Design a protein around this ligand. Structure first.
Ligand SMILES: OC[C@H]1O[C@@](CO)(OC[C@H]2O[C@@](CO)(OC[C@H]3O[C@@](CO)(OC[C@H]4O[C@@](CO)(OC[C@H]5O[C@@](CO[C@]6(CO)O[C@H](CO)[C@@H](O)[C@@H]6O)(OC[C@H]6O[C@](O)(CO)[C@@H](O)[C@@H]6O)[C@@H](O)[C@@H]5O)[C@@H](O)[C@@H]4O)[C@@H](O)[C@@H]3O)[C@@H](O)[C@@H]2O)[C@@H](O)[C@@H]1O
Ligand SMILES: OC[C@H]1O[C@@](CO)(OC[C@H]2O[C@@](CO)(OC[C@H]3O[C@@](CO)(OC[C@H]4O[C@](O)(CO)[C@@H](O)[C@@H]4O)[C@@H](O)[C@@H]3O)[C@@H](O)[C@@H]2O)[C@@H](O)[C@@H]1O
Ligand code: MG
Ligand code: MG
Lengths: 551, 91, 924, 99, 50
């Protein structure tokens, strides 16, 4: 009786067949491509949606009701554990982990001499899985470490987020990067694949996050781990990056201009492509909501006057550590860091170095009618005439998304040295001076601003001398703020440093005068520095997931 | 049964205005009237002579008013319940 | 005459069905069958959703249609409904099990017209109707919109003149300090380019029209002792009330039967050919029309389509959307045929072999014209999409029946073998970069851009061996036993086949000799039945771990395409990128049949010489091992969805059908048919992930287990705050202020949070009833069918944007007219919350505010007709001649608690119009 | 190693309408038939095809455009024509001998 | 009413042609043969590998 067996599935591959040795490269490509195709406008792997809680940027859109859950996150009030955005980001990151685990399981069943690059592919998959786990750990303090590729689907219901403590989870995350650093090639011909230098840098980042211990039920900082700091220094040593051929770009804007994709500073980047055979190309759909109103719609992720004032500098070239926010930045009288004109597009200035599109303080450029200000982010946007920009119901560009930057590596090394305080504060100041000198030289596209709008550029390296630990830490924090503004790491840096509550409360108080959105905003000491574990996930895994402290 | 009866069909265009003895050029894209005068002419006591609006339109300024035109002057033209704002500059 | 005679069988009166004059007979029988819910949106097609005996399974709940012995699940709107002899609804598992293996959700047998023996007849029916829009949603005009915006601004404390929408408000304060608005003025042009003049536009009237319906049927039948035949031609056309939406259908039916060799052999066939061409309304067109403000003109200054500019909300022009969608017409061909052969070797033996065929073809061409409506544009994207779909279902049947009439015992024994095979396929081509931008020019060959190709295919097979035995003693005691062995290709070899028994008992109490003196009691029958039926209506690839090579060529909104293509080299594409595979689902090799057990108890009565007839039914349905698509735990990632037998559903219900027919002394014939039914649904078991995610109810907050299917959990709105003293007295909550919604503290913890939610929604009516009245008097016949539903709650999404300002996705959207009567110090006697520009109180949350009383009673159909007298008919040489005028959905009564309109359709779906019809019937 | 699939679909729809009026006369030995007629014909043809490349399993079950992972092409065309005719016929027979 | 089935396997391998056919004709005479209504319909399905 073949009547009930004649028909077979069409156009699919079964589970028994997907383990064949010829599909391993296909699974590798799938695991890579989840990072460019598995993100939404409201849930992007850059985490700019969840970085609005910081003081760097507001949330754009028509108003507060446009993305009400994200407005609740931004004001740190009225946040519910049953948030669709929280559940979505959890599910998407674990989907990336699942693809990586499937690729790893397929790889583990192959012969070494038959597949010479088996170890390299395994290292790349472990790197991707660790990246997803690191992002999950940043968003949620308590996460499930899914690091067993040869694990049956039925056993996933028994997984719990309390199996390992905070330090143990950090060690589990760092193990993947340790393996990736051990097994990856020094140089990769394909820019998409991570290199040994990228693995080492991201391992250093993991160890730096591990150093700031958060033992105890609450989210309070408990101390600094000297062993973790030494590991950070060891893995951020400049010899590794010299072998990998990575270094600071001659100009700041080269990192975000499409013409200089996969540059020296691009340690690792999600590769976005245009007209590559798909419906609209592997465009950065996560940044689709951030395009200015001049393109037609969206207009999210607006920078903040606090960030502009932070970019404002003094007459000696140093950031104003105490009086930067007293008055709004004045273009004609105040010295300004040149990085501001690459990060934030102020009104009256060309949009993405285009003279034909001058940002104006009208409604044609702000969707919210001045509720969220008029500043426009420029790092994730491109020129309207780039030809790398496409309209697929959301204006999206083929610009690569850099995850690890050599500037980040240098600032991380400086942080490790400063927190060690073993006599290498001078070396940390040297690294900060290197970054500042790069910023000073980065004026290739805004040189005419001096004679066109009266813009005064004045930034100078710090003097090389003995510095106290607190002074060095403050200088480093300011350097990080002015370097990685609008790049979706300010809130995570604040949480890691432990000053997030005070900084956010001060920002709310300061900005409530010029913005009515922060009228009822308030940050809780031990609750709002980490996203709550989704209530749907907790209910699904009954008696296994514990909610974060304060929720 | 649905219309609100606001009488929005009126027109608020400005054809041309004459200050003393100097006609003005009107640009509708930016709602700007520009009146050219001699360099030595005194514009602190200008007199409005004529203002040809649309049918049924009413302007803020009246014919025969004495105005100081040292700075741009805002004008509102109202027809029924619609209005348009122009700016007059004497250069 | 009931086919089963011992189960839950409802006989539908086809004359009253055709009196309503609907394209879909299923939609026509909307409320004429107890325990059978028909929901119809009102689109030009007769497409409707049928639920028999409530919700009985978590997967597909559609009933099984059997037309001339051919089982099918496709809708009847695409067939001809004016050639039906009888309709029988089998709602009992025991009674309907023998008609197919897909009888879990009820079966509808439709017997088409056949040539009556010894006569030839013809019938021509014509009908022309006008459909008018009745539920015109009231939205703010220009002045009302400006007034509402000013009220919101002054309530929030901001300066209304800062609205930056061209509104200038002259306003002041009264003695008490409450703001008042003396007047308003508007800028002529919404933009600085003077291209979009301000206007008062009725968008609903602009996008709606007066639709026209025309129906022409011509049937002709001829019978004889050696055979019979029937031939029908039908045409239907319906222009929807929404512009540029329509549906037309041609139909041709040919039936015949031939008797040979002293009636030993019989060969019959029933074939029908249908061609339906339809243009459908775009999704959320009513929503867009409600959202777009009335200040936007339909046409710009230069004659192009008007659109939002400046600060106006980003909503597309509904008229332009309809104009661009008018070309998206699809053609659908249906070939529904059957051929059977019957052989009678001797008196009691019958062998029937039946072959059925159902071939469906669908051809569509979708166009994407470039549009630029103010700031709304698609960057000049021109594209075409040519799609083709094929469905081919064929059934083979073999039935052997024997009948015995020994003594007073009547015994029927039937055995049967049935095979079903369905194969579906579809493929589409997509082209871009066109120049002329007209339907004639837009073809994939003429395209000059990126091309895409899509295509898929699937199918399944069913095998069934069934047996039935009927025993009747003294024509007083009836017993029925049936057994079914069913297997499907959707299960593994180990769990392929399943066995379902069913038993039915019946007792004609009126035949007993101990009540022969009860002359008034004409007939009384008590019947019971316990049956089991099988369900397998799941995805074809359910037991397989699916890995698909999703390159990413499918359009996706928001960019979550989950495609598999990465520029691993890092060259911004420029060619065919490397691809791979992604997991769609996890296979499960232990999936088996869902088992539905139904227990039915019925009492049929007939009194006063068949003048007062009726039936009372009580049923209990229990579905176990329900095949449900449980999602992943959450850390399992993509493809974690899998089919499992971990469900349990219960349905207790009562039904009561009544009818009274009698004459009158002066010559009035009145026929009354009453109907009332009720049921209760409950979920008993559910997978943990399903209960957590709340797909079947609970909104993901509380498990739906132990509650009705689709029940929702939300807050409780205890009025609104009227003073700062009230705000302070109430328990603390975020965003509480004067004029805001007050939420009850369920657990009395002193703070409003997630835990302050309870069960607030129950989509189960208290009871649904219907009444049909037929009055005949001096060649005048008046038919009047009312349908009512009582005790049903509905979640009103229209209230979300008709009772609140700035509670939508984006601000400054158009709202309902009743928004004007919001609470204020000047307007204290009100319950609508005060207007505000920010949703600080988070009033978008699910709460009792959006739950309304959906109870209603509407006159479904009224029809007055005049029949030409027989003597004039014979003088003019034609048979029965009739004219009629009818109204459909003319009148309705709704509860005062329903703030909206049309309780049957309280959402943004397609509106239900009022139909005024004039028709004639000629018999020649 | 070129792997590709080509899914093609074609439709032909021809419909004809006819109207014939005929009269016959049998006067004397003369037989006379007179027929007039009007005919309308309409033919509409269309076709479209999708083409996909870069398949892996290389079996008819797997080879579908969705399962393809390569360059895609789309073709499509349509045409038609219409005919109108007015015809008349007259037959005369004398003595059943001359036609 | 007619039902027909035809199948032909060509002499060249992997080439074949099969055809199903169903024809229904009828004519009806009404009103003392004054009116006549007739129909001739046929449904064919041919599957071929060339
Ligand atoms: O919260 C409600 C439900 O959504 C859930 C589902 O689980 O999750 C949210 C879910 O929704 C997504 C969509 O992919 O994001 C929505 C989310 O994104 C926000 C910013 O946070 O705004 C996005 C921006 O997009 C715009 C348009 O540019 O708004 C999109 C808006 O409009 C829609 C349909 O809207 C309606 C509903 O039928 O139809 C008409 C036309 O819009 C409106 O009147 C109705 O509101 O589509 C836009 C139209 O464009 C088309 O392509 C053709 O014209 C069609 O797709 C639509 O007709 C929807 O896409 C959406 O509602 C812009 O206004 C916004 O700024 C935020 O505003 C919004 O909430 C996804 O990311 C996320 O996963 C659950 O939370 C819950 O059940
Ligand atoms: O994506 C699903 C979503 O979109 C809609 C309409 O936009 O459906 C589109 C797809 O539905 C398909 C697949 O079944 O058919 C439905 C349409 O085709 C019609 C033609 O008469 O119905 C055919 C057949 O399908 C049913 O509706 C389901 O069994 C039957 O009732 C009917 O007999 C037409 O009625 C439907 O519109 C496919 O053709 C479309 O691509 C929505 O329906 C759905 O929500
Ligand atoms: Mg790129
Ligand atoms: Mg409470």
């Amino acid at each position: 009786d073949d009547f009930l067996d004649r028909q077979v599935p069409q156009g699919i591959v079964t589970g028994d067949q997907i383990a064949s040795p010829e599909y391993v490269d296909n699974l590798v490509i799938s695991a890579y491509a989840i990072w460019a195709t598995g993100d939404d406008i409201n849930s992007s792997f850059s985490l700019w949606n969840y970085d609005v809680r910081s003081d760097d940027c507001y949330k754009g859109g028509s108003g507060t009701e446009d993305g009400g859950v994200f407005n609740a996150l931004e004001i740190s009030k009225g946040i519910n554990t049953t948030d669709w955005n929280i559940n979505d980001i959890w599910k998407r990151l674990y989907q990336c982990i699942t693809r990586a685990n499937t690729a790893l399981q397929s790889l583990d069943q192959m012969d070494e001499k038959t597949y010479p690059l088996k170890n390299q592919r395994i290292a790349e998959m472990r790197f991707l899985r660790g990246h997803a786990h690191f992002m999950l750990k940043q968003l949620f303090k308590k996460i499930v470490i899914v690091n067993d590729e040869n694990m049956e689907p039925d056993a996933y219901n028994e997984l719990s987020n309390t199996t390992y403590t905070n330090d143990e989870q950090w060690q589990k995350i760092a193990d993947d990067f340790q393996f990736a650093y051990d097994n990856l090639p020094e140089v990769q011909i394909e820019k998409g694949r991570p290199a040994q230098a990228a693995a080492a840098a991201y391992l250093a980042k993991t160890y730096l996050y591990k150093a700031y211990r958060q033992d105890g039920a609450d989210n309070a900082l408990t101390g600094i781990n000297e062993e973790d700091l030494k590991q950070v220094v060891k893995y951020t040593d400049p010899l590794i990056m010299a072998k990998g051929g990575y270094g600071l770009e001659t100009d700041y804007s080269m990192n975000f201009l499409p013409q200089y994709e996969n540059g020296a500073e691009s340690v690792w980047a999600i590769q976005y492509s245009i007209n590559d055979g798909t419906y609209n190309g592997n465009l950065n759909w996560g940044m689709g909501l951030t395009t200015p109103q001049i393109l037609g719609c969206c207009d999210f992720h607006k920078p903040s006057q606090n960030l502009v004032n932070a970019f404002k500098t003094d007459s000696q070239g140093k950031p104003l550590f105490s009086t930067y926010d007293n008055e709004n930045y004045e273009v004609a009288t105040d010295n300004v860091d040149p990085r501001l004109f690459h990060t934030v597009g102020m009104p009256g200035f060309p949009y993405k170095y285009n003279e034909g599109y001058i940002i104006q303080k009208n409604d044609d450029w702000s969707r919210s009618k001045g509720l969220y200000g008029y500043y426009v982010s420029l790092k994730e946007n491109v020129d309207p005439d780039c030809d790398c920009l496409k309209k697929g119901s959301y204006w999206a560009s083929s610009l690569n998304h850099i995850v690890i930057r050599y500037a980040d590596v240098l600032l991380m090394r400086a942080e490790a040295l400063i927190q060690l305080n073993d006599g290498r504060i001078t070396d940390a100041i040297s690294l900060i001076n290197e970054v500042r000198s790069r910023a000073a030289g980065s004026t290739m596209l805004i040189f005419n601003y001096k004679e066109d709008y009266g813009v005064n550029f004045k930034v100078t390296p710090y003097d090389l001398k003995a510095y106290a630990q607190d002074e060095a830490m403050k200088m480093l924090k300011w350097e990080r703020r002015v370097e990685f503004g609008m790049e979706s790491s300010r809130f995570f840096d604040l949480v890691r440093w432990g000053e997030a509550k005070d900084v956010i409360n001060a920002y709310y108080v300061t900005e409530a005068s010029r913005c009515s959105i922060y009228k009822n905003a308030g940050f809780t000491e031990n609750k709002n520095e980490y996203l709550p574990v989704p209530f749907e996930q907790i209910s699904a895994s009954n008696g296994n997931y514990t909610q974060n402290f304060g929720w | 049964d649905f219309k609100s009866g606001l009488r929005l069909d009126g027109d608020v265009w400005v054809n041309s205005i004459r200050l003393d003895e100097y006609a003005g050029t009107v640009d509708y894209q930016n709602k700007a009237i520009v009146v050219g005068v001699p360099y030595d002419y005194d514009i602190t006591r200008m007199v409005v002579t004529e203002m040809n609006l649309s049918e049924g339109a009413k302007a803020s300024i009246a014919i025969g008013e004495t105005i100081d035109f040292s700075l741009p002057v805002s004008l509102t033209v109202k027809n029924g319940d619609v209005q348009m704002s122009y700016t007059i500059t004497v250069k | 005459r009931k086919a089963d005679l011992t189960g839950a069988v409802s006989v539908v009166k086809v004359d009253e069905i055709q009196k309503q004059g609907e394209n879909n007979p299923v939609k026509a029988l909307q409320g004429r069958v107890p325990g059978m819910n028909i929901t119809a949106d009102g689109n030009p097609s007769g497409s409707a959703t049928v639920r028999i005996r409530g919700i009985g399974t978590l997967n597909n709940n559609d009933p099984l249609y059997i037309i001339d012995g051919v089982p099918t699940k496709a809708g009847m709107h695409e067939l001809n409904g004016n050639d039906i002899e009888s309709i029988q609804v089998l709602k009992d598992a025991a009674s309907a099990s023998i008609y197919g293996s897909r009888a879990a959700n009820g079966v509808i047998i439709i017997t088409t017209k056949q040539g009556k023996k010894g006569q030839i007849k013809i019938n021509f029916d014509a009908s022309v109707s006008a459909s008018m829009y009745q539920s015109k949603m009231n939205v703010l005009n220009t002045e009302q919109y400006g007034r509402a915006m000013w009220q919101a601004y002054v309530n929030d404390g901001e300066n209304p003149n800062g609205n930056a929408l061209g509104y200038a408000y002259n306003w002041g304060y009264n003695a008490d300090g409450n703001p008042v608005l003396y007047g308003m003025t508007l800028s002529k042009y919404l933009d600085s380019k003077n291209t979009m003049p301000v206007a008062d536009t009725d968008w609903f009237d602009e996008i709606t029209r007066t639709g026209v319906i025309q129906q022409y049927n011509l049937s002709v039948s001829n019978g004889s002792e050696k055979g019979s035949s029937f031939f029908s031609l039908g045409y239907y056309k319906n222009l929807g009330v929404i512009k540029d939406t329509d549906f037309d259908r041609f139909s041709a039916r040919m039936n015949s039967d031939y008797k040979l060799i002293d009636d030993i052999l019989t060969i019959g066939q029933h074939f029908t050919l249908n061609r339906t061409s339809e243009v459908q309304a775009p999704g959320g067109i009513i929503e867009t029309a409600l959202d777009i403000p009335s200040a936007i003109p339909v046409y710009a200054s230069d004659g192009s389509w008007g659109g939002p500019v400046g600060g106006w909300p980003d909503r597309r022009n509904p008229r332009a959307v309809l104009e661009y969608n008018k070309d998206n017409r699809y053609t659908y061909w249906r070939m529904f045929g059957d051929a059977y052969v019957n052989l009678t070797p001797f008196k009691g033996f019958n062998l029937r072999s039946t072959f059925g065929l159902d071939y469906a073809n669908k051809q569509a061409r979708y166009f994407t014209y470039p549009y630029q409506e103010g700031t709304q544009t698609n960057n000049g994207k021109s594209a075409v999409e040519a799609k083709q779909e094929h469905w081919t279902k064929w059934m083979w049947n073999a039935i052997a029946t024997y009948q015995l009439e020994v003594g007073k015992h009547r015994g029927d024994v039937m055995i049967g073998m049935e095979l079903n095979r369905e194969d579906d396929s579809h493929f589409s081509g997509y082209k871009e970069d066109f120049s002329i931008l007209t339907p004639d020019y837009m073809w994939p060959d003429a395209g000059s851009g990126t091309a895409q190709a899509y295509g898929a295919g699937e199918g399944y097979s069913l095998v069934s061996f069934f047996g039935k035995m009927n025993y009747s003693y003294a024509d007083r005691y009836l017993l029925s036993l049936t057994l079914r062995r069913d297997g499907s290709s959707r299960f593994g070899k180990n769990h392929r086949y399943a066995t379902f028994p069913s038993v039915s008992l019946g007792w004609r109490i009126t035949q007993e000799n101990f009540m022969k003196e009860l002359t008034w009691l004409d007939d009384l029958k008590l019947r019971a039945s316990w049956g089991q039926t099988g369900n397998q209506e799941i995805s074809n690839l359910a037991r397989y771990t699916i890995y698909a090579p999703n390159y990413g060529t499918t359009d996706s909104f928001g960019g979550q395409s989950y495609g598999t293509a990465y520029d691993i080299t890092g060259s911004n594409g420029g060619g065919v990128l490397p691809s791979g595979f992604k997991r769609n689902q996890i296979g499960n090799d232990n999936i088996k049949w869902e088992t539905t057990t139904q227990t039915n108890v019925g009492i049929d009565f007939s009194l006063f010489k068949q003048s007062l007839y009726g039936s009372l039914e009580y049923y209990y349905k229990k579905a176990t091992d329900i095949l449900t698509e449980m999602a992943g735990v959450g850390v399992l990632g993509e493809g974690g969805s899998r089919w499992i037998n971990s469900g349990a559903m219960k349905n207790q219900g009562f039904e009561f059908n009544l009818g009274y027919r009698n004459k009158t002394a002066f010559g009035l014939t009145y026929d009354l048919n009453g109907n009332i039914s009720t049921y209760r649904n409950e979920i008993l078991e559910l997978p943990e992930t399903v209960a957590a995610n709340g797909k079947f109810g609970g909104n993901g907050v509380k498990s739906v287990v132990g509650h009705t299917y689709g029940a929702q959990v939300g807050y409780i709105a205890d009025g609104i705050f009227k003073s700062q003293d009230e705000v302070d007295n109430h328990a603390t909550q975020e965003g509480a202020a004067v004029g805001r919604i007050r939420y009850r503290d369920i657990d009395h913890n002193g703070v409003i949070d997630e835990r302050d939610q309870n069960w607030i929604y129950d989509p189960t009516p208290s009871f649904s009833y219907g009444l049909n009245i037929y009055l005949e008097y001096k060649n005048f016949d008046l038919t009047m069918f009312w349908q009512g539903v009582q005790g049903v709650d509905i979640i009103s999404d229209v209230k979300k944007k008709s009772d609140f300002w700035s509670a939508s996705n984006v601000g400054f959207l158009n709202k309902g007219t009743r928004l004007l009567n919001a609470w204020s110090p000047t307007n204290p006697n009100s319950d609508i919350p005060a207007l505000t520009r920010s949703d600080t109180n988070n009033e978008q949350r699910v709460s009792t505010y959006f739950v309304e009383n959906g109870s209603f009673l509407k006159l479904r159909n009224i029809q007055l007709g005049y029949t030409v007298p027989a003597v004039i008919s014979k003088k003019m040489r034609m048979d029965r001649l009739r004219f009629y005028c009818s109204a459909q959905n003319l009148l309705t009564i709704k509860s005062k608690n329903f703030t909206g309109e049309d309780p049957e359709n309280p959402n943004f779906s397609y509106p239900i119009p009022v139909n005024i019809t004039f028709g004639l019937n000629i018999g020649f």
